[PDB]
Design a protein around this nucleic acid. Structure first.
Ligand SMILES: [Cl-]
Ligand SMILES: [Cl-]
Ligand SMILES: [Cl-]
Ligand SMILES: [Cl-]
Ligand SMILES: [Cl-]
Ligand SMILES: [Cl-]
Ligand SMILES: [Cl-]
Ligand SMILES: [K+]
Ligand SMILES: [K+]
Ligand SMILES: [Mg+2]
Ligand SMILES: [Mg+2]
Ligand SMILES: [Mg+2]
Ligand SMILES: [Mg+2]
Ligand SMILES: [Mg+2]
Ligand SMILES: [Mg+2]
Lengths: 226, 226
RNA sequence: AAAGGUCAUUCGCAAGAGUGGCCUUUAU
RNA sequence: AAAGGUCAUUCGCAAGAGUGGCCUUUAU
């Protein structure tokens, strides 16, 4: 790995590795080598879940376990990890196989998010739980300072079905009416039928559930609930 | 709290609380008080999954993240926590409401398993991460020394469907043929129809998926696969 | 958090290593 | 890991606090 890139990353992360081989392995995707970051990712995911649980427990003494669960999901889900990866410019540091280099793997959300978790595993093994907890809390400071509990942490599909279920109304139906693209790069169009609306609401996305979420968001607005 | 009970538990756990009020809250089920252990359970669950991940990562350097994930599930699932709760005789320390005391709540697996997680949260808040990690590793020493990776950690339903899918055979049909008892205390009977087997295989349990697992277990044996 | 199947797809003579969509199963 | 609905059910005059089965949704 090129030390020009690795030294910049260590500066941005706030952590200089004693064992550079741990950092190299954390940055190595399985397309590049049989010695890759998948075990580190498993370990780092578990550290992250604990650090964020502890942070929410202390920051929000009056909220119940449901609130903390939804807040933690917002913070540790793949989309948020990918955001952090882009903030660290992590794509420049990934060790990828040739197939990935030629297909945009350095921008691939799943690989970026996995590598954030693997870096946490690596920093932990290079130091200790106290050190990596402080590092994660630094990375998350702005998000933890801005997050708030309540139904704003509930996704649109959840909010819509609870709105309907609480009024003994039928659950919405979601139907794929159109798929455009090739089997590996699709755009879905969903039509959502909702009790009380005369027309289906439309949502689009690169997966069916992303399109359903977009459709549920539209239904909530058309129902004048938000 | 009654010192006789508290003193025995602390000897069993291997840990004496500095703040007894944390211990009381950890032992308090929501049937008993509005100040109960649910937030502590959320926190303790996250600590336990980190501690076990770290232990498996170090004890099994050659296994992949799939092996570690299944092994962790075996160790942290509700049935294992309830086992530990029985070993700590936790039922005797639970603080329950009158409805629970009169319906056997001190034996309810969900409540017992939750309280193990809540106590982990409480020890953590009473000390620090390194202390609670040491304690959990003491509690799990015999289980960690005995556990082994491989297909043995896959449940019967998973094993059966992978056998059939890998041979492009139909997945099993799990038919509920009988549900005996009241709606809150039932026995399910499942008939599982498996390609290659003459007659359906029978499973029973207190939940439909428990009955399905029992039937899958029988189907694997009759297929002479195990 | 993982598993399996399937359709497609990047690299590769291949061997083989990946990625996306969909389905099924398990744990938290 | 949590949420909601439902069918039962423990305690309770009730208010209210639980528990089990089933379904739906979300995250890991
Ligand atoms: Cl620079
Ligand atoms: Cl609060
Ligand atoms: Cl942040
Ligand atoms: Cl679809
Ligand atoms: Cl090993
Ligand atoms: Cl007990
Ligand atoms: Cl059923
Ligand atoms: K696939
Ligand atoms: K229920
Ligand atoms: Mg994760
Ligand atoms: Mg992960
Ligand atoms: Mg748990
Ligand atoms: Mg729990
Ligand atoms: Mg994963
Ligand atoms: Mg739970």
């Amino acid at each position: 790995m090129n030390p020009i890139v690795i030294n910049r990353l260590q500066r941005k992360l706030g952590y200089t590795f004693n064992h550079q081989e741990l950092l190299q392995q954390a940055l190595t995707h399985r397309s590049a080598s049989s010695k890759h970051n998948a075990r580190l990712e498993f370990l780092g995911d578990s550290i992250l879940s604990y650090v964020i649980a502890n942070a929410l427990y202390h920051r929000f003494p009056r909220v119940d376990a449901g609130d903390m669960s939804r807040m933690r999901a917002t913070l540790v889900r793949g989309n948020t990890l990918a955001e952090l990866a882009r903030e660290f410019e992590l794509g420049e540091c990934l060790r990828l196989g040739p197939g990935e280099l030629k297909s945009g793997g350095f921008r691939r959300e799943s690989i970026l998010a996995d590598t954030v978790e693997a870096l946490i595993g690596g920093v932990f093994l290079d130091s200790d739980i106290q050190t990596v907890e402080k590092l994660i809390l630094n990375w998350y400071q702005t998000r933890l300072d801005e997050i708030s509990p309540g139904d704003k942490q509930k996704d649109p599909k959840t909010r819509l079905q609870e709105y309907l279920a609480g009024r003994h109304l039928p659950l919405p139906t979601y139907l794929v009416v159109q798929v455009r693209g090739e089997a590996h790069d699709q755009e879905f169009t969903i039509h959502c039928q909702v009790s009380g609306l005369s027309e289906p609401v439309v949502g689009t996305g690169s997966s069916r559930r992303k399109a359903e979420q977009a459709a549920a968001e539209q239904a909530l607005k058309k129902l004048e609930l938000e």
